[PDB]
């Protein structure tokens, strides 16, 4: 949903790519805020880690601040690519139309959006698509990545390097379950299943297997 | 963007629908708000002129706010018509998504979802899609239908009949302008050419004509 450190963050992101100082009058104007606004909603995300107003009074994002602000370009810009390329809205209409969606699209319909657009290196308007690479198009934990709901879905890694008990090595071996092995998963506790075999995992192995 | 309002007007159409008498505690169920803050948010509504409460405190919605919970559930369900049927969205997370889109999606994207989609009549989830006659897939006037730039459009209606100076009549006879002619548009006074005439309208045809 629509955020304001959403945008703050993204303003900031703006300026940085244009080659302009993040300062907070830049921002107040590109953000159509008064001055006193501005200072009052940065020194909120001051205070949640997202930005740090530097010696020269620019803002730094941190590093937490500069994920936010590039999955919200990155949603932003996709989005246009769906207004132009599928939707056909009037060009004139597509960033602010963007503007409003990059707070409420969701990394799943990146993902498939990734998958249906023809090309997703520039917005129609000639800038980068940045964070593919973390949005996924290694992996998510079984443990936050499983549900009720056995769906399938793929090892990325399995992590047997910081395991310290190692009795599920073998099953897993088993159950051919590998890297790269499309396999199921329901957590009811994690039970990824392959081979017509079911894994009910360790607290562990939940936590550093990625799917 | 975002809007209670919106989502509370939403919420009503969707009991009414279902069946179930428009109750502020059937809806603070549903919105998952406390009773305090429906009642709260309700009073406002009051004053707005969205809603009355009935002397069976049930929620009554103005011809206003129906009509706007109606165009919300129709951009709520064009949203997941283009989520399932063009971007390809897990099912189970559609109606979570189009919540959110419901608040964001433009008129204009609605209008282009009806022309790309291959069916409009019901959601996925098997419900009608209202609206679309409000939606416009009888116009909008001249005045408030053109800017500076001489974008085309299509005359849906002239309405002579209200008008008292007739001095253009004649002009738009002779520029070939009539109902169902596709014209230029620039708001600059309103211009509206054709047949490779211009046409600068006054005060009155510019408020009535739509486009
Ligand atoms: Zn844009
Ligand atoms: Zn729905």
């Known amino acids: 949903?629509?955020?304001?450190?959403?945008?703050?963050?993204?303003?900031?992101?703006?300026?940085?790519?244009e080659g302009?100082?993040?300062?907070?009058?830049?921002?107040?104007?590109?953000?159509?805020?008064?001055?006193?606004?501005?200072?009052?909603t940065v020194a909120?995300?001051?205070?949640?880690?997202?930005?740090?107003?530097?010696?020269?009074?620019?803002?730094?994002?941190?590093?937490?601040?500069?994920?936010l602000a590039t999955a919200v370009?990155?949603?932003?810009?996709?989005?246009?690519?769906?207004?132009?390329?599928?939707?056909g809205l009037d060009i004139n209409k597509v960033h602010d139309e963007a503007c409003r969606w990059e707070h409420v699209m969701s990394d799943e319909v990146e993902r498939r959006l990734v998958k249906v657009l023809k090309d997703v290196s520039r917005?129609?308007?000639?800038?980068?698509?940045?964070?593919?690479?973390?949005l996924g198009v290694p992996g998510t934990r079984?443990?936050?990545?499983?549900?009720?709901?056995?769906?399938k879905v793929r090892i990325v890694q399995i992590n047997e390097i910081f395991q310290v008990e190692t009795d599920q090595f073998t099953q897993?071996?088993?159950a051919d379950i590998r890297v790269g092995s499309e396999v199921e998963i329901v957590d009811r506790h994690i039970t990824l299943s392959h081979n017509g075999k079911d894994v009910?995992?360790?607290d562990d192995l939940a936590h550093t297997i990625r799917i």
Chains 1, 2 share one sequence.
């Open 1 to 17: 949903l629509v955020d304001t450190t959403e945008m703050y963050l993204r303003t900031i992101y703006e300026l940085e790519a």
């Open 20 to 40: 302009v100082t993040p300062l907070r009058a830049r921002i107040a104007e590109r953000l159509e805020q008064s001055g006193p606004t501005v200072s009052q």
């Open 44 to 67: 909120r995300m001051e205070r949640d880690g997202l930005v740090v107003v530097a010696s020269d009074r620019s803002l730094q994002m941190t590093p937490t601040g500069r994920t």
């Open 73 to 87: 370009m990155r949603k932003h810009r996709l989005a246009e690519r769906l207004l132009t390329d599928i939707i």
């Open 123 to 134: 917005s129609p308007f000639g800038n980068p698509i940045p964070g593919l690479d973390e």
């Open 142 to 151: 079984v443990i936050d990545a499983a549900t009720s709901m056995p769906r």
């Open 172 to 174: 897993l071996l088993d």
């Open 200 to 202: 009910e995992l360790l």
